[PDB]
Design a protein around this ligand. Structure first.
Ligand SMILES: CC(C)=CCC/C(C)=C/CC/C(C)=C/COP(=O)(O)OP(=O)(O)O
Ligand SMILES: CC(C)=CCC/C(C)=C/CC/C(C)=C/COP(=O)(O)OP(=O)(O)O
Ligand SMILES: [Mg+2]
Ligand SMILES: [Mg+2]
Lengths: 348, 348
């Protein structure tokens, strides 16, 4: 709704300070670690809040769709919130990290934490502590709940798989030999599956599943099934709406290619190509010069992107629905729909 | 003994490959993450093995002293081993990290992992995955044991506190204002308590305690009591044997001061000092120039270090014993002795 969802949207946001107090109130003052926990705070305040929170919100949306009238107590609802910021923290850590390794300058509207003078490389540790923050919250809010371990285990599992995906990227994207060789569809989409899909779609719906009880192994499998497509499309999509479309564009409007970024666009490009363009774009890609950058677009355009994007997004919402009605016996479809209704939209 | 201990010393070492197989055998081949897990291996092989392992060994020593004839099965002994490498991994992660932030060149005899061309900043992620490796092993070997959570929780707790200590260092030691201001005893020793003491002395004996059952809160407290002194002295000591003594010196023989390293030596120095030396050493410290470096020694010498070192190490082994016989009702003293018998030795 253009009503309830926004409210939840605000409950969650109203919850920060709390987690923030949670995280350090006691720390601020320890005649030993005091300085430390006080930095922690700002590392926390500068970094975590700032996205749309839609990841974290997701948990709360699902727990809502999943619990029963017994399990709607204030007390339950809080955790649902807690376990939410936990995903919102997980991602901070990560993206604080990514920033350093990618030597970026800007994030979510402001300057990278590593960039703040005084800070620099120390961010490596600040990242590590954001990571901790996550298991410091779950411990506080869930430690006495049948699903504690299931949660400890989920988060911990997911960081590994994501750490792998990231780790994949790094290798795949390097300007030593720049290369458009090892930009394989199968590779791209493995980068996708692992660096964003798990922590972005699975971890929260799944975390909702364990808190109401559904700890069935092949029920998690029936989730992973559906959601991973959605995480794939979603990223593919986020890939198009970066160069191929603009009107009212949210997230961050502007663009890349300057960054040798492995992106559906290119991948697609590189196989509707011939030795002529193949060098055209393999030449002026990954480089930030208005002719080039603005020129590689041309080639994409020269090959016809919004087509495959179309025969893409056309195929998915199809594939998706099916996947639901083969994977949705035991879990309210309202869930995968909700995600749908706010994830599949596109721009020509 | 100049016998059994070395054998354990070798059982443990013989255990690596295994953990190594554990960690990746299945991974090496996944037609998605394969490249990733294959790098993982070498990140693993280059980094983890190489110390003396005395940290990890400690666990096994304690479990041995602690279990009963029922709990000496091969199967139990293995975990004891497993949970050992887990500390050996925890520290890799860490020190891979420290290397980058400190811009060092060399480690445990070889060149830093970040330094290997091709690698560089990617190490930030390699560190993160070494971290994971730790919860990937405990899950494999303990997941079905009453103390699983107690262990998950111990490791996780300890990284936080250590991450804080590290985080303390960073702040305390910076050459913007270089400073010998915020080199406070109380600060130093807080850096000690938190960046090395917990993961070096508490985490393994404690982990031994939870695996035999002693999960008594004020029994952990009776451990933390004793061991933390030992971790303090131990580091203080490691501090003296770096500049003040040399014959047959183990770990790494050579030295520092080049590194504005906060070290008992200095701290001590800086309060048996006057405005004259105070600038002498506050001048030529943290700097690598044979006059200086070799000159600040002089001042230490000019103030008389091996004295306090003496009235130090003299006071401790005292304080220590007491702490044992006030903290050792429920836990075999043979344990804190063993650590003693191989931690307190000194060099004039
Ligand atoms: C759990 C954990 C702490 C893992 C450590 C490894 C790490 C730094 C992973 C990055 C995850 C991620 C979403 C990166 C951003 O992608 P991107 O390269 O596309 O950069 P972008 O957001 O600027 O587009
Ligand atoms: C658990 C975890 C992954 C924490 C991340 C934070 C981090 C990098 C901590 C460093 C711990 C440590 C023993 C550093 C070495 O000390 P040192 O500066 O004295 O350097 P040195 O060994 O060369 O003497
Ligand atoms: Mg980046
Ligand atoms: Mg270092």
């Amino acid at each position: 709704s253009p009503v309830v969802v926004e409210r939840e949207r605000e409950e969650f946001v109203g919850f920060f300070p709390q987690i923030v107090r949670d995280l350090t109130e006691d720390g601020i003052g320890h005649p030993e670690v005091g300085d430390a926990v006080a930095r922690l705070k700002e590392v926390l305040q500068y970094n975590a809040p700032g996205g749309k929170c839609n990841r974290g919100l997701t948990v709360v949306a699902a727990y809502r769709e999943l619990s029963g009238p017994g399990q709607k107590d204030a007390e339950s609802l809080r955790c649902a919130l807690a376990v939410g910021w936990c995903i919102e923290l997980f991602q901070a850590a990560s993206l604080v990290a990514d920033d350093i390794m990618d030597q970026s300058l800007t994030r979510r509207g402001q300057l990278c934490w590593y960039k703040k003078e005084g800070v620099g490389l120390d961010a490596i540790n600040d990242s590590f502590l954001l990571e901790s923050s996550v298991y410091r919250v779950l411990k506080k809010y869930c430690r006495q709940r049948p699903y504690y371990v299931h949660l400890l285990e989920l988060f911990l599992q997911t960081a590994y798989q994501t750490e792998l995906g990231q780790m994949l990227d790094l290798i795949t994207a390097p300007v030593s030999k720049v290369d458009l060789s090892h930009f394989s569809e199968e590779r791209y989409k493995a980068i996708v599956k692992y660096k964003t899909a798990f922590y972005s779609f699975y971890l929260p719906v799944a975390a909702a599943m364990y808190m109401v009880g559904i700890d069935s192994k092949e029920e998690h499998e029936n989730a992973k099934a559906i959601l991973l497509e959605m995480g794939e499309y979603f990223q593919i999509q986020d890939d198009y709406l970066d160069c191929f479309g603009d009107p009212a564009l949210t997230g961050k409007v502007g663009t890349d290619i300057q960054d040798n970024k492995c992106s559906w666009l290119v991948v697609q490009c590189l196989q509707r190509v011939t030795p002529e363009q193949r060098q055209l774009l393999e030449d002026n890609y990954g480089r930030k010069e208005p002719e080039k950058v603005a020129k590689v677009k041309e080639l994409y355009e020269a090959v016809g992107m919004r087509a495959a994007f179309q025969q893409y997004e056309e195929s998915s919402y199809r594939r998706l629905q099916e996947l639901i009605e083969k994977h949705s016996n035991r879990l309210p479809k309202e869930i995968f729909l909700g995600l749908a209704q706010k994830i599949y939209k596109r721009q020509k």
